[PDB]
Ligand binder design. Structure first.
Ligand code: SY7
Lengths: 237, 300
């Protein structure tokens, strides 16, 4: 069925599953033409395909060249996403292929289903959750690799860094979603919080700072405060 | 003009012949239906006064033999049977007409409704959808399930309609996933028309038969099939021009003949709004569009 707060711990069982987020596949700036009309200019994008168990972020970089000469690009983007996800599954050994793929937007269901017709025993699921994966381009290292790409690419990131050595998948996923929710609501403050202390550094192959266990607690607290404040402002509560 | 005699009418029943129906009382002197137009298939159907559930009936073609109705008190229904002895049959029919105990198939001369609803329907094709080859006529009822329905349970009593599934390998070419899903022309034209149906007349016949089983028996799986065959054409960018014009006429008479107070379950909101207003063929169904708007503007 659909994935929600009731069946939330299912992500951390031993059935391989992937989340697929397509929000950042087709990315445009909007600008004025000489004649005073409006045109879009695309920039590089990415499919965010995440194993919420291991931390693997199968980042497929979508180069602007894939849109050249194509119409209805927001619709194509969903099919391109499904084509790339299906290709990934095919490339993987049988015992690494997911048993479920959970899409973060329901418009991806039919394109993925159609592209996965050859995998009848992979379940394609929507979710009721409001996951903050769109904020992935607020992670500096991920944004950098996408913007610098000159061709289609697939880069495998560990979005949990070394966290699983000390915490569970459940706790790692909650930390990730809390960081991304913060980056999504107020990128500037969220980033100030993460880099305030110049003595804390980021490991060359890692996305986030080297916090000790107690520093993570302080950081996680600072991120919650941010997310609540922003909400008061949003609504007037 | 041919005749379908009835042995007796032991139970109170609403009898239908094509788009006509008559009420017959328990043990009323009733011995059948005369003046049935030759050259078309026909359906004779039944709803018992005591059980508004299970409408049932027989598809038949009088060119294919002499057929009569007889109530079976064991199985509890009006059964169609064939009389092999021609002279026994002529004589039963003559005696019953002489005593004027038969109703007359009540065709208005100006009226082409039944022809328009059955134009492409062949008895030989009905018999392959309803498999029971010891009889020349075909039984259908409210509860019978279709083959596709049975995949997602008794096969002898299934409606063997052609399986249509837009999210299947049969419908989607490897490498053409987006193309074939948004433009079903290859599935319509190559897979179904050329491959399976051979020609559009057989396609139109199954579509027409599906609609009629849905209308007369409230057969839900026939209604799914009808809508499915409509949506496959409407969702193809490339349809022969003769097919679109004929489809418009077909749907027009189906929509015209539907009972007005049945449009809630028999008509699928999503298929019709898509076909009439979004699909490639949104502008090729002028007649069907006009009658739907003036008669069911709520659905849309
Ligand atoms: C196809 O995948 C890759 C991956 C990368 C290279 N990565 C990256 C990565 C991380 C950060 N910045 C990047 O900015 C291009 C790329 N992910 C690494 C990684 C981490 C954990 N588990 C991993 O996999 C389970 C992978 C790995 C790498 C490269 C360089 N140094 C490493 O040090 C030990 C490790 C580059 C190219 N192709």
């Amino acid at each position: 069925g659909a994935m929600n707060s009731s069946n939330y711990a299912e992500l951390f069982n031993n059935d391989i599953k992937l989340f697929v987020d397509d929000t950042n596949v087709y990315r445009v700036t909007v600008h004025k033409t000489f004649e005073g009309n409006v045109a879009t200019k695309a920039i590089n994008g990415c499919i965010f395909t995440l194993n919420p168990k291991t931390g693997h972020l199968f980042l497929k970089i979508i180069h602007t060249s894939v849109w050249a000469g194509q119409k209805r690009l927001s619709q194509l983007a969903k099919w391109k996403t499904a084509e790339e996800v299906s290709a990934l599954v095919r490339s993987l050994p049988k015992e690494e292929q997911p048993k479920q793929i959970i899409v973060t937007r329901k418009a991806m269901l039919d394109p993925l289903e159609v592209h996965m017709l050859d995998f009848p025993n992979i379940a394609i699921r929507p979710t009721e959750l409001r996951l903050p994966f769109s904020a992935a381009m607020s992670i500096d290292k991920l944004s950098d690799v996408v913007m610098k790409a000159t061709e289609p690419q697939m880069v495998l990131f560990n979005i949990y860094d070394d966290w699983l050595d000390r915490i569970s998948s459940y706790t790692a996923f909650s930390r990730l979603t809390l960081l991304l929710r913060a980056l999504k609501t107020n990128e500037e403050s969220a980033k100030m919080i993460l880099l305030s202390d110049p003595t804390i550094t980021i490991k060359s192959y890692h996305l986030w700072p080297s916090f000790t266990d107690e520093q993570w607690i302080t950081i996680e607290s600072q991120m919650r405060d941010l997310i609540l404040t922003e909400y008061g402002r949003k609504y007037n509560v | 003009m041919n005749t379908v005699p009835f042995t007796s009418a032991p139970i109170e029943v609403t009898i239908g012949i094509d788009q006509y129906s008559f009420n017959v009382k328990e043990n009323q002197p009733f011995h059948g239906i005369k003046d049935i137009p030759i050259g078309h298939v026909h359906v004779i159907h039944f709803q018992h006064a005591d059980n508004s559930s299970m409408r049932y009936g027989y598809w038949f073609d009088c060119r294919m033999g002499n057929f009569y109705i007889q109530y079976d008190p064991k199985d509890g229904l009006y059964k169609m049977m064939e009389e092999r002895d021609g002279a026994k049959f002529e004589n039963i029919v003559h005696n019953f007409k002489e005593r004027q105990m038969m109703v007359s198939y009540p065709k208005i001369d100006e009226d082409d409704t039944w022809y328009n609803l059955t134009e492409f329907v062949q008895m030989d094709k009905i018999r392959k959808i309803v498999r029971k080859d010891e009889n020349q006529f075909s039984y259908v009822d409210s509860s019978m399930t279709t083959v596709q329905e049975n995949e997602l349970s008794d096969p002898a009593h299934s409606l063997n309609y052609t399986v249509i599934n837009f999210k299947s390998r049969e419908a989607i070419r490897p490498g053409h996933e987006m193309e074939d899903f948004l433009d079903k022309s290859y599935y319509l034209n190559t897979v179904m028309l050329q491959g399976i149906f051979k020609n559009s007349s057989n396609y139109f016949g199954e579509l027409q038969f599906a609609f009629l089983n849905a209308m007369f028996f409230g057969n839900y799986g026939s209604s799914l099939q009808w809508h499915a065959m409509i949506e496959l054409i409407c969702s193809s960018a490339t349809v022969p021009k003769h097919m679109l014009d004929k489809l418009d006429e077909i749907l027009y008479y189906q929509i015209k003949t539907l009972p007005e107070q049945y449009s809630d379950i028999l008509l699928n909101e999503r298929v019709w709004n898509i076909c009439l207003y979004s699909s490639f063929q949104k502008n090729s169904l002028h007649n069907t569009e006009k009658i739907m708007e003036n008669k069911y503007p709520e659905l849309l």
